[PDB]
């Protein structure tokens, strides 16, 4: 506690409202680097900043990846090169953001979790799975295989921990199930696992839905919808 932490979180909050996620991420990275635990709010400000920063690049990457595929069919060298290069440019930005977060997760956030801070360990492991997943979206060959494995390990470990020490309605445990299911469908290409996981997690939540507070009831159903929407979409051919 030797530089002013509250100011940094306050800058993060400002930047968020100004939709300036690069600034936001840089503030929360600084907060993280002070090496103390993050509050629930602070966790989310980090999560949100980097999700938006990498998301802008995922969105770009997809638009360009798709242009590259109709373009290559027309066979223009100059244009095929140009598009390939620009896609690469975006890739390198995306990956650099991904390491940035992953490094914070490995070397600060996860590291400094005590054995019984199960909620935090799960949040951060899910996040680690997410960001390796985002690398997998744009990787190919041996590189892809490696980050896919890294994603699985993080999503899997978060699953074990969340199964035992968190209840099935908890937003984080649902969010994990949601993203892990999506990992299965989109990266592993394993629809039956995707669905089983989403279904299981949905059903387990419904069981406990009886005695949910009215506060947490809004939080859980929001995510449970998305599980269902996906399942509906996946079970349709």
């Amino acid at each position: 506690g030797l530089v002013d932490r509250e100011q940094l979180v306050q800058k993060a909050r400002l930047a968020e409202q100004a939709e300036r996620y690069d600034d936001m991420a840089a503030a929360m990275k600084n907060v993280t680097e002070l090496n103390e635990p993050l509050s629930n709010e602070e966790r989310n400000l980090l999560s949100v900043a980097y999700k938006n920063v990498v998301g802008a690049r995922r969105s770009s990457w997809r638009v360009i990846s798709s242009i590259e595929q109709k373009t290559s069919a027309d066979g223009n060298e100059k244009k095929i090169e140009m598009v390939r290069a620009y896609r690469e440019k975006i890739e390198k930005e995306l990956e650099a953001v991904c390491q940035d977060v992953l490094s914070l997760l490995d070397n600060y956030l996860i590291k400094n979790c005590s054995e019984t801070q199960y909620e935090s360990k799960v949040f951060y492991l899910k996040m680690k799975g997410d960001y390796y997943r985002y690398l997998a979206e744009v990787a190919t060959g041996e590189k892809r295989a490696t980050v896919v494995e890294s994603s699985e390990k993080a999503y899997s470990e978060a699953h074990e921990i969340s199964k035992e020490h968190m209840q099935p309605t908890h937003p984080i445990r649902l969010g994990l199930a949601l993203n892990y299911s999506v990992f299965y469908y989109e990266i592993q290409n394993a629809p039956e696992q995707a669905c089983h996981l989403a279904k299981t997690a949905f059903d387990d939540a419904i069981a406990e839905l009886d005695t949910l507070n009215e506060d947490s009831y809004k939080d859980s159903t929001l995510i449970m919808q998305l599980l269902r929407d996906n399942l509906t979409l996946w079970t349709s051919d």
Binding site: N44, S47, V48, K51, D130, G175, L178, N179, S181, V182, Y185, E186, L222, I223, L226, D229, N230, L233, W234
Partner: peptide, 7 residues
């Protein structure tokens, strides 16, 4: 295509 978190 599928959907992930809303944050």
């Amino acid at each position: 295509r599928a959907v992930s978190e809303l944050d």
